Every structure is written in structure tokens, then in C-alpha cells.
Amino acid sequence: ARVAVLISGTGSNLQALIDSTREPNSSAQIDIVISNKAAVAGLDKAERAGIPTRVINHKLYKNRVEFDSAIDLVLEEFSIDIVCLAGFMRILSGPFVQKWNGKMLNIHPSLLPSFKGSNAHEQALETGVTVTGCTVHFVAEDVDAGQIILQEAVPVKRGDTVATLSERVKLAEHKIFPAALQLVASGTVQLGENGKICWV
Ligand SMILES: Nc1nc2sc(CCCCc3ccc(C(=O)N[C@@H](CCC(=O)O)C(=O)O)nc3)cc2c(=O)[nH]1
Ligand SMILES: NCC(=O)N[C@@H]1O[C@H](COP(=O)([O-])[O-])[C@@H](O)[C@H]1O
Numbered sequence: 001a002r003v004a005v006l007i008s009g010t011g012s013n014l015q016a017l018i019d020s021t022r023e024p025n026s027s028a029q030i031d032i033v034i035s036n037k038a039a040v041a042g043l044d045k046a047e048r049a050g051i052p053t054r055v056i057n058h059k060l061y062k063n064r065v066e067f068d069s070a071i072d073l074v075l076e077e078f079s080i081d082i083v084c085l086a087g088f089m090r091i092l093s094g095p096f097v098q099k100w101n102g103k104m105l106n107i108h109p110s111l112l113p114s115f116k117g118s119n120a121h122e123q124a125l126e127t128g129v130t131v132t133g134c135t136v137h138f139v140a141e142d143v144d145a146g147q148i149i150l151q152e153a154v155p156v157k158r159g160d161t162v163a164t165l166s167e168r169v170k171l172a173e174h175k176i177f178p179a180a181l182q183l184v185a186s187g188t189v190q191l192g193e194n195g196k197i198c199w200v
Contacts, residue, residue, distance in 0.1 A: 033051050106144075107173050
């Protein structure tokens, strides 16, 4: 399966995906890394790994659909099968999400359905949970509302901040995101016609 990773920041999940997909038994190959920000560590990790890169600036497109269309064009040029959102901090349009239904994964730093949205660690800390985690899911039109592929629980420790909790959750993210990509790329997990998740 040919994989595109879309990034926006440091790309520690990108690095985890690079590491696992280079293993001999990987059913996925990362063929392109796409960023909406042109000076991010993620781009450098891709270049270090010999992966082509492309930067798409919203400042050249009139709307989301136009911008996602630019992404989609690069995906088609690279004959991409699967899209991983790895710290990608834009919201995707309906048609783009519709087109990639069942073929786009996202990593979210909470145990969904808890703490949907942008500041999941702050939400978890304000709520007082003692257990949080991360979730790999298929991307649906409702943000953080697609089918769940894998999750991993992570303890919250007294005195945690966004800094320390995100650090601990990310170790978990670096495990389930590669596993999830491997499950989808091998066809072991798929989105069934009923929109439910199938283990084959
Ligand atoms: N179509 C589609 N596109 C996308 S992109 C993606 C990865 C994450 C992108 C960054 C992001 C993700 C979510 C939010 C957000 O909702 N913020 C709320 C917080 C809500 C609350 O507090 O409860 C607020 O601003 O208030 N902001 C930025 C997932 C996804 C998806 O599932 N569907
Ligand atoms: N659902 C959106 C969201 O909050 N994404 C979060 O952004 C970070 C990117 O880290 P990375 O650049 O080290 O992969 C990840 O920790 C991920 O949980």
C-alpha cells in the first residue's frame, strides 16, 4: 500500500511511521510527505529518510476545497492508497474526506469519544481523568468521529501538565499509529460497506 503522510509540526509520529514502514514485513511504504507549513521538523525527517516532500500553503487557495484539491492532486500523482494525518492541524473538506473514506487515518491524543477537538490534553487535565490515551481512527466528516482502529491507555500522573502528559501519550502514539497503518495496509482492518470496521 502506498502511503502519504500529512504533517504540520515536529513529526515524531512521522518518524515512528518511517521507522516501522521500513521494516521488511511492512505492508506500507511512505511515498510522499505533505506539509501545510514550510519550516517544520517533519519535512526534515522526511528528507533525511529519502522521502519526497511537498509544502502546500493555504495562502495560495481561496477555500478549503481548493486547498484540499491541491493535496489530492499530489496524492494522485504519487498513486497513493492511504493517507495518514500525523499532526496535521487543518480541517479537511467534506468532499476530500468523502473521497478518502476508509483510506485516511488520524492519530488523536485522547481515548475517543472523550475529548474530541484541538486541545485534548488540556481537556483531559481540566476534567480530572486519571486515565487518558490516544486513538487511531478513520477520518469521517464529523471531526474525531470516524471508526476507531486502535487505542492505548496512558496514566495521568499528579502534577502533569500538557508538556508531561503529551510526552507520555506520544510514546503510546508511536506504538499504535504504526500498528494501525500496518493493519489497514495489509487489509487486516477495513471499513465495511456498513461503515463498521472489519477484521479480515
Ligand atoms: N473533516 C475532518 N478533518 C480532520 S483533520 C483531523 C486531524 C486534526 C486536525 C487539527 C484539529 C482538529 C480538531 C480541531 C477542533 O475541533 N477544535 C475545536 C475543539 C472542540 C472541543 O473543544 O470540543 C475548537 O476549535 O473549538 N481543531 C484542529 C481530523 C479530522 C477529521 O476527523 N475530520
Ligand atoms: N487530532 C489532532 C491532534 O491533536 N494531533 C496531535 O498532534 C501531535 C503531533 O505530534 P508529532 O508532530 O510529534 O507527530 C500528536 O501528538 C497528535 O496527538
